Amino acid sequence: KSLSLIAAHSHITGLGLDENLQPRPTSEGMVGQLQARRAAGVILKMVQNGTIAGRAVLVAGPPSTGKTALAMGVSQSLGKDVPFTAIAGSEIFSLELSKTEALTQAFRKSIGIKIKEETELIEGEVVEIQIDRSITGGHKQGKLTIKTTDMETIYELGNKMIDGLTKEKVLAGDVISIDKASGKITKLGRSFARSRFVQCPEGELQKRKTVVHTVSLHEIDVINSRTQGFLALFTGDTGEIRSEVRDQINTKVAEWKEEGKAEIVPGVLFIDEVHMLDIECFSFINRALEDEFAPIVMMATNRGVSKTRGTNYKSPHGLPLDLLDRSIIITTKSYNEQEIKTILSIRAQEEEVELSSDALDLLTKTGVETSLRYSSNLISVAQQIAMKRKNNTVEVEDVKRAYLLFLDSARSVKYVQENESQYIDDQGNVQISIAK
Amino acid sequence: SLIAAHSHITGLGLDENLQPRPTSEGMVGQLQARRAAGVILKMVQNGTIAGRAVLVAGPPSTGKTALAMGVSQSLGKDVPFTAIAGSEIFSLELSKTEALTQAFRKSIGIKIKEETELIEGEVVEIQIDRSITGGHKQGKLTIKTTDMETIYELGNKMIDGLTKEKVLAGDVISIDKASGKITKLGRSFARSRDYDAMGADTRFVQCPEGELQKRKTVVHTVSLHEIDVINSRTQGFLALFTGDTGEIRSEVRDQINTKVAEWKEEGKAEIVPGVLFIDEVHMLDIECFSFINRALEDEFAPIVMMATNRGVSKTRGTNYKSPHGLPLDLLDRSIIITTKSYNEQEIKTILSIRAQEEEVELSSDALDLLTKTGVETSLRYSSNLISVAQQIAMKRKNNTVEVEDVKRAYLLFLDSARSVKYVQENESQYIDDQGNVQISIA
Amino acid sequence: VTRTAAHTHIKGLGLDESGVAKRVEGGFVGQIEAREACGVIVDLIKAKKMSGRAILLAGGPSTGKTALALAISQELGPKVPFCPLVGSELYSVEVKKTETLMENFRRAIGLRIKETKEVYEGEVTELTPEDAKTISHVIVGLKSAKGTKTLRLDPTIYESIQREKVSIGDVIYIEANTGAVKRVGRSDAYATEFDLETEEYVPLPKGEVHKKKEIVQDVTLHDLDVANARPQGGQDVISMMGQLLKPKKTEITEKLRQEVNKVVAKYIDQGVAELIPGVLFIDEVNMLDIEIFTYLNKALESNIAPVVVLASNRGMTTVRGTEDVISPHGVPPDLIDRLLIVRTLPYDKDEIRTIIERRATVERLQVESSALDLLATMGTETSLRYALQLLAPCGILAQTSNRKEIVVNDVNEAKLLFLDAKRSTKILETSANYL
Amino acid sequence: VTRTAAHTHIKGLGLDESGVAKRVEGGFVGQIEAREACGVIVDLIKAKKMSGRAILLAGGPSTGKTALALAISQELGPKVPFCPLVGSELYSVEVKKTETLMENFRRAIGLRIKETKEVYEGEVTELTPEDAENPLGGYGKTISHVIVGLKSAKGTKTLRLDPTIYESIQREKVSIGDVIYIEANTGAVKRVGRSDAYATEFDLETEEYVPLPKGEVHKKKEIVQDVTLHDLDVANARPQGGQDVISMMGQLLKPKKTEITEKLRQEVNKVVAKYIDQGVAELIPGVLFIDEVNMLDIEIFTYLNKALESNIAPVVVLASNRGMTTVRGTEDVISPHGVPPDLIDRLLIVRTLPYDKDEIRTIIERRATVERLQVESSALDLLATMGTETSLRYALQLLAPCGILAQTSNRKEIVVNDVNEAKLLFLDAKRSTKILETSANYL
Amino acid sequence: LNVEKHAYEREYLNCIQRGYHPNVSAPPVTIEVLGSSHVTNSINNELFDPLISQALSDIPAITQYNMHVKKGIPVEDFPKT
Ligand SMILES: Nc1ncnc2c1ncn2[C@@H]1O[C@H](COP(=O)(O)OP(=O)(O)O)[C@@H](O)[C@H]1O
Ligand SMILES: Nc1ncnc2c1ncn2[C@@H]1O[C@H](COP(=O)(O)OP(=O)(O)O)[C@@H](O)[C@H]1O
Ligand SMILES: Nc1ncnc2c1ncn2[C@@H]1O[C@H](COP(=O)(O)OP(=O)(O)O)[C@@H](O)[C@H]1O
Ligand SMILES: Nc1ncnc2c1ncn2[C@@H]1O[C@H](COP(=O)(O)OP(=O)(O)O)[C@@H](O)[C@H]1O
């Protein structure tokens, strides 16, 4: 389940918080940033309460300060069965959808409906199957013996059950699941009988089982529109769904909640790099947040006073002031030496790399000096240099060798700036020849 | 047929030591460029190296396209020569890189060896069995020569080729098995009881004698791009003619490369690379140049010839100026053939050759005045004047162009310098760049 | 249970019978003149006599323009069509922007049809076709828990019955007017014919076989336009898998529109349909190109144009698509002649305090008096929206300390945790690299 | 004999067992530290544990960056998927650039599955259909069942088919006397050809004649297949392979790139993880190579910043020859190598160095010995001085005209005079620019 | 007006070999509704529409003989193939 090699945020299992929403210094893979974690815990409580809608928050700070780490912590603390959509700023610039339509689809993907239904099921291990044919074979008679670990029974079959058993061959000793009302029979496997391999089911054979469904508003939006089927949820060409089906879906969902047949589960939409949206997207986002079925929007940006896209002026955070008026802003700060070394030790534990104390100190020094991501990339590349000399622990010499082999930002700018005759400039001039 | 601009050039005019003759094969002058083009021609004919870019540069009306046509005519048959312009890359349904990939793959030919069987003889009896609707078709054919007579079995396509191009008993047909083609050669029986339904006057041919079934080995050249278009989808053979081949995936190209290498490894097919010619290559985006720089490094890459008549000008897609309008990365991996302007004797020989091709009997002094007006003005103007002078000359009903008809044609039709001289003193009559004009004459 | 999103304390304009507005009534505080002008416009809409009337309401940000348009929508009632819109939505990659404007115009004119639902439901007891081969009629006997009832049927409904594979003993649903046939399932009394079968068993309906109900259908002109202009063809009732070709939005010809108008007028003349004109509301009108602004001039001169309401917060701003045209509110001077402008005023301290108290009441929160004074001072110092957004984290921080009433300390912690735009810009200015 | 184009003298990085590069090994000359860093990257890729690791190959023109990427691909072997790409490929007219980038990301991850196939095969002996009692009833088809009798070497089976398999059998145009191949996973039918048990000289359809298949009729065989994740996504988004009318009509439509949703990717990942948990499939992560990375827009870089943080991402290798250059799509952002500072933090830069005169001389030596040419020593010294004076590449591709001019004089030796003639006939960028400046009308 | 067939038989296109086949082939995504036979009926009707699946292939010849001669059904009443 959920195959993954190692992620860059794989150590974050949530927000480290107490029962009084106080952040521990080291919990759940998150260290430091006490005020930002407290604010994100308040936002998490806002989402889990579910009584308010359409509030936008902004996580702003310098680069490499843990904004995406905060978003991943909120997403892991939400758990399953709550919608979480994560998009980038450049994702909505489509050739087949308008920008407002893509933003609308991303908005309605983040709110879901919890529907609870029950179905009656058959589960057991097949003992013996008899199919009988007549002289002409016009009618078919049958008997099926099926057992669990507690009972055993024999059923008399009709024509459509016999046809459904002949199709998708079922032999003796197979564990199968039968849905009577739909006629779908699945082979769970084979029982443990030497004389795939699953165990024989226990308890009753006729079980009424309850399955809790959660379906987003965008799925019912696609299915209710007749212009395409449910295969557009996978192929991805929905093609500018009309508004009137969305008002029908809104009214139907409202009366479903009134009757008690459904519950509304709002979620979080996360927009990473929100400064790359046009001003039309910002103006749509301003008026899309006052709807009753609107999620809580999280935006993350790292710019200063920069040019807003599609305009000719400059704005704080790259966003216009009317969008910033409806936002509450969480500010992240830079890290210390101890926080950097704790981050590097946690990244060592997740990458299964054993480090010396001196190697950790050198990594902390070069991480304070250059970048946190540079040391977090150097630590995994030092282990291969250590393993080429056939030893397990990563020492100082491996870190110095990796620091010599792989450059960083400021050093690369420094070697470029006194060798610029060999590189292609903004004017397209270069010197390739060695002499003259 | 009809007369084109470079209709007098069929070849390059080179000796066995790759040294050009002064006037041979429709080409006169330009010895260094002709020698370099002959070297590139032998480089193509060896077929041992791939992905080499050649740039031809010089002033306008010098013979760059003449050199490209000479290379194409000296290339010979069954060697692909794709000639495109720089403006055809930009398309509404294809990306620029995809169009450049297709133009690259058009210039690589695959020569496939096939083994066929030929059957010729008189038809004795045709039996055709069909369904009630008409879908399922089968039948037997009894063909016969002088010595042998066998009975064959027929399929759907063979019955379709038999029904259209109507065959009766007594007709002589020729069948090719691997191509599925039926040709009727004539009739021999001369049946008496003819139902008068058609006006057939079929030829009387003789009885074919000897072996009924003969084997032969045939060779045909297909392009690589045709194989991708055929293998791309279900009805790609229609897309070969309608041009509806939208962005063929990379997996198709990988599998086609693997199967082409497998066919080469057995002896069924061999690879014949060709020449891709890009005229006005400066009319290209910088993304096209960045794609060309890395598409020249592949195994299946033709030799690319480019022509430019541009100096240090702006490179498209950028805001700086570069030599020949090309970035320095593309100019790094190119060898450059330069072309120089002409003399008076070369211009006289060009005009005499173009008069010989267009069948115009020019006088001596008419040729001297055409050379004079072709050395003051450009060469193409004096080349264009010859047909007009001829058409003026047939109005007086004499089949010899004098200097009077040439003077009349020079009076009637203008040059560029006379046009800018007339425009620049009457700027109120013509529409200004600011859109102002004077229409009233008072 | 109950959700709240930036509104829903706004219930109406809060006017008396004379058209005058009270101070605090209907969720609105302040702004008497704009509310009275909007009530006059609501009366004009209810008159149902004029077409192509354009109103612009202008003012600063967070002054109450969208609340006024929402109050218009609540005062008109659910019967009148109301089509809210943002100006950025008129740009699409499928059709031109003028066609999208035409569709949004025609979405604001509605119709009311009075129809009758007639339903036969029960267990099939008799199914006897007969030849007149072509069957002339079939006799179906239906059974419920309150008796049985037999029906003659046309052969088309028998064809639809043969589509659904209906046998004796199935519970079916027949609609008399449309002719739709739905198979609910086999009846519960026939459930022990086999021990195991692929058929679902449903009980008998406990009501009568015959059911009669009067309903009202509300459609718009745009629904008829898109129903009459399917390019691929008429879709069936149920298509779970998609159409083989993707149907794309097209440029609907005005000949189709005039045919739809002719048919609708013919049905109106017979007393079947009722015409309900409505309101088209375009928020952020300054985001329109000048070509849409030119097309609005001809679109306002049609005979079936609705009442159009536009909003803007810009000042003397260049019109989009132009470079040397400066016009008030971002609206070009050719179009600004055709509207009537309603001005909207900023608020005072006491109005801000009353708005904050109302928002705390609707969100089911208790606040202290000193917390209310601090929140009012913060609202006057930063913005009105900041205190409204900061009200709910104050409630959460009061909840985590096991209390039910917000005090000054929770407001101080919420002010510490979350910033406004001014303090964020102050941090942005005095920073080294990118905040 | 063979065909050579600008490469294929490079057979790998040419390192030792400890990671130390030799001076001349694998066709490489010099660039020792770059080759050692690339060997460390090769070991990291072969470890099969890391996701979203990005390196950047930064240097001047003609310093060997594409050669190093080719050596990476040759050292990893053909089992690991390698996806070469230029920066201009991502601008497609059918779909957005973000989807093309994610498609190449999923195309760079491989898979190896051992698949069991249920197979019926044999020579068709009897083909007899049975009819329906009311074929014009509107619902239900014309026939009910088709009896097919197949025989093999030591075996004969009679099968009763539903109509749906028979429609594929009829579409394959089978008859009595043909060897067929029915696979039961998707219902696909392959018609092999006529059986050899009858006469083979009385046809006109150029068909080949196969004998009977060995073994029984009903088999279960194991097949090892190598697929990528993009193949699974493409097969699920445009479904062909079933016997339903959606699948048969999916083959006849013109193919077009669509925006594959994230839901399909998560479901494909879940199915692949369930396959791996059963011991059936194994995961082979690979390398995506993007050349001329400065041709990308700011939006593609901003999407790369998020695409590298996924948990299934491959190892990405970039290359650029740019100094302080404005990023495309921006007007004021000046950044090293044309790559924005948000991406440089997630990168490890490998720097390539220019060459020396002796390195130019020996590189010309290997390029001459690969093209099957022999040169003199003085001509080699002239070529090395020429490569230092103008460019390495201009000295590299002057070899073939020299060889042609040597061949046309009936010699198998490249001498100084042939190199002088190649200078006289072909120019370089500097001499062409010098002609262009001192020109009348852009000569 | 017959350029395409002449280009077909000029280059021997009925004896060439196939070079590409897809890597993965899949049926459409199954939709499951627990406890409803109507969904199964509608899905089976959409996937295996008898008009459309009958239109994409033929009828056996002896079956056509049983229609036309032994049952008196005319050719114009055939489901078209
Ligand atoms: N407080 C923290 N606790 C644990 N890991 C952190 C913290 N802050 C940053 N990191 C790690 O640092 C790396 C880079 O930080 P990131 O969140 O990408 O920066 P940005 O906020 O600019 O996106 C990530 O892998 C993240 O896991
Ligand atoms: N050496 C030559 N031999 C024959 N014709 C020539 C020669 N040089 C020029 N021409 C004629 O002069 C014209 C040159 O134009 P063209 O080659 O198309 O453009 P450019 O010379 O700018 O490359 C051609 O029409 C060609 O017929
Ligand atoms: N007079 C008022 N009484 C109560 N609430 C108001 C009033 N005016 C504005 N508001 C509130 O202010 C918030 C923002 O106002 P809004 O309608 O967005 O103004 P604008 O559209 O001009 O920005 C809304 O949630 C609304 O409830
Ligand atoms: N170390 C080397 N050994 C041998 N040949 C090399 C070496 N480095 C570069 N070359 C050759 O020089 C040329 C450089 O091309 P390429 O690497 O594509 O350009 P760049 O260096 O700009 O990436 C290639 O033809 C390559 O064969």
CB atoms within 10 A of CB B43: 18
Asked if B275 contacts B268 with a C-beta cutoff of 8 angstroms, the reply is no
How far apart CA B330 and CA B53 sit, in angstroms, is 9
Contacts of D36 in chain A (CB under 8 A): 405
User: How far, CA to CA in Å, does D219 sit from each of A409, B434, D122, D149, D155?
Assistant: 61, 83, 11, 16, 12
Asked if C229 contacts C254 with a C-beta cutoff of 8 angstroms, the reply is no
Distance C28 CA to ligand 3 centre (A): 9
Task: Report residue D318 as tokens.
Answer: 């970039």
How far apart CA C195 and CA A99 sit, in angstroms, is 57
Whether residue E32 and residue A184 make contact (CB cut-off 8 A), yes or no, is yes
The Cβ-side half-sphere exposure at B257, using a 13 Å CA radius, reads: 10
Asked whether at least 3 C-beta pairs link B and C within 8 Å, the reply is no
Pairing mode of beta strands D324-326, C28-29: unpaired
| Listed residue (C143, C211, C151) closest to C172, CA to CA | C143
DSSP state of B207: P
Instruction: Please check whether residue B318 touches A, CB under 8 A.
Output: yes
How far apart CA B24 and CA A182 sit, in angstroms, is 86
Asked if E37 contacts C200 with a C-beta cutoff of 8 angstroms, the reply is yes
Give the burial string for D298-331 (b: 16+ CB within 10 Å, else e): bbbbbbbbbbbbbbbbbbbbbbbbbbbbbbbeee
Contacts of D397 in chain B (CB under 8 A): 52, 333, 335
DSSP state of D302: H
- Which-ligand-closest: CA of B24? 2
Query: By three-state DSSP, how is residue C217 classified?
Result: strand
| Listed residue (C8, C16, C2, C4) closest to C67, CA to CA | C8
List the helix and strand counts (H, then E) for chain A. Answer: 14, 16
Task: Report residue B136 as tokens.
Answer: 């399922």
Instruction: Please check whether residue E49 touches C, CB under 8 A.
Output: no
**In which residue are the tokens 């029908």 written?**
A248
User: Which value, in Å, is the radius of gyration of the alpha carbons in chain A?
Assistant: 30
Describe the crossing of helices D416-425 and B31-46 by its angle, rounded to 10 degrees.
Answer: 110
The Cβ-side half-sphere exposure at C115, using a 13 Å CA radius, reads: 13
Give the burial string for C76-108 (b: 16+ CB within 10 Å, else e): beeebbbbbbbbbbbbbeebebbbbbbbbbbbb
Distance A408 CA to ligand 2 centre (A): 56
Looking at chain B, after which residues does the C atom sit over 2.5 Å from the next written N, breaking the chain?
none
The Cβ-side half-sphere exposure at A258, using a 13 Å CA radius, reads: 6
Q: What is the largest CA-CA distance in chain E?
A: 60
DSSP A118-129: EEEEEEEEEEEE
Distance A269 CA to ligand 1 centre (A): 20
List the 165-194 stretch of D: residues with Cβ below 8 A of B.
173
Query: By three-state DSSP, how is residue A308 classified?
Result: coil
How far apart CA D404 and CA C142 sit, in angstroms, is 97
Pairing mode of beta strands B171-176, B149-154: unpaired
DSSP state of C424: H
Whether residue C164 and residue E36 make contact (CB cut-off 8 A), yes or no, is no
Total CB pairs under 8 A between chain A and D? 206
Contacts of E42 in chain C (CB under 8 A): 238, 240
How far apart CA D274 and CA A3 sit, in angstroms, is 9
Tell me, using a 6 A CB cutoff, whether residue C12 lines ligand 3.
no
In sequence order, what are the residues at sequence separation of 6 or more whose Cβ sits closer than 8 angstroms to the Cβ of residue B198? none
| Listed residue (D128, C65, C249) closest to A238, CA to CA | C249
Task: Report residue B266 as tokens.
Answer: 């057995």
Nearest CA to ligand 1 atom 6: A66
| Listed residue (D312, D348, D345) closest to D51, CA to CA | D312
Write the single-letter amino acid at C318.
T
DSSP A171-214: -TTEEEEEETTT--EEEEEE-S----B-PPP-S-SEEEEEEEEE
HEC-encoded secondary structure of D299-339: HHHHHHHHHCCCCCCCEEEEEECCCEEECCCCCCCEEECCC
Distance B423 CA to ligand 4 centre (A): 55
Task: Report residue B223 as tokens.
Answer: 């392009």
Whether residue E36 and residue C240 make contact (CB cut-off 8 A), yes or no, is no
Asked if A313 contacts A324 with a C-beta cutoff of 8 angstroms, the reply is no
- Main-chain phi, psi angles of C351, to 5 degrees: -65, -40
Cα D35 to chain centroid distance, Å, stands at: 24
Experimental technique used?
cryo-EM
- List subunits contacting chain B, requiring 3 or more Cβ pairs under 8 Å: A, D, E
Comparing CB atoms, the residue among E4, E20, E68 nearest residue B255 is: E20
Q: Which chain C residue shows the shortest CA-CA distance from A119? A: C200
Query: By three-state DSSP, how is residue A66 classified?
Result: coil
Length of chain B: 442
Which element (helix H / strand E) includes B115? strand B108-130
Asked if D162 contacts D103 with a C-beta cutoff of 8 angstroms, the reply is no
Ligand 4 atom nearest to CA at D57:
23
Asked if D116 contacts D225 with a C-beta cutoff of 8 angstroms, the reply is no
Cα A32 to chain centroid distance, Å, stands at: 24
Nearest CA to ligand 3 atom 13: C62
**In which residue are the tokens 């101890």 written?**
A338
Q: Is B208 annotated for ligand binding? A: no
Comparing CB atoms, the residue among A54, A98, A232 nearest residue C5 is: A54
Distance D346 CA to ligand 1 centre (A): 12
Which protein residues are within 6 Å of ligand 4, measured from CB?
Answer: D 6-7, 27-31, 61-67, 321, 363, 392
Nearest CA to ligand 3 atom 9: C64
Distance between start and end Cα atoms, chain C? 40
Asked if B212 contacts B117 with a C-beta cutoff of 8 angstroms, the reply is no
Write the single-letter amino acid at B289.
F
- Main-chain phi, psi angles of A186, to 5 degrees: -115, 140
User: How far, CA to CA in Å, does A98 sit from each of A105, A280, A318?
Assistant: 11, 11, 22
Whether residue E40 and residue A183 make contact (CB cut-off 8 A), yes or no, is yes
| Listed residue (C368, C375, C385, C381) closest to C412, CA to CA | C375
Whether residue A38 and residue C390 make contact (CB cut-off 8 A), yes or no, is no
- Main-chain phi, psi angles of D190, to 5 degrees: -115, 130
In sequence order, what are the residues at sequence separation of 6 or more whose Cβ sits closer than 8 angstroms to the Cβ of residue B49? B43, D3, D4, D5, D371, D400
Comparing CB atoms, the residue among A2, A387, A424 nearest residue D323 is: A424
List the 309-328 stretch of A: residues with Cβ below 8 A of D.
none
Tell me, using a 6 A CB cutoff, whether residue A65 lines ligand 1.
yes
Write the single-letter amino acid at C44.
L
Distance B19 CA to ligand 2 centre (A): 20
Nearest CA to ligand 1 atom 3: A30
Asked if D423 contacts D395 with a C-beta cutoff of 8 angstroms, the reply is no
Which element (helix H / strand E) includes B398? none
DSSP state of B380: H
Q: Which chain B residue shows the shortest CA-CA distance from D407? A: B17
| Listed residue (B72, B81, B80, B84) closest to B109, CA to CA | B80
How far apart CA E20 and CA D231 sit, in angstroms, is 14
How far apart CA A88 and CA D304 sit, in angstroms, is 10
Contacts of D208 in chain B (CB under 8 A): none
Which element (helix H / strand E) includes D426? none
Q: Is B59 annotated for ligand binding? A: yes
- Which-ligand-closest: CA of A66? 1
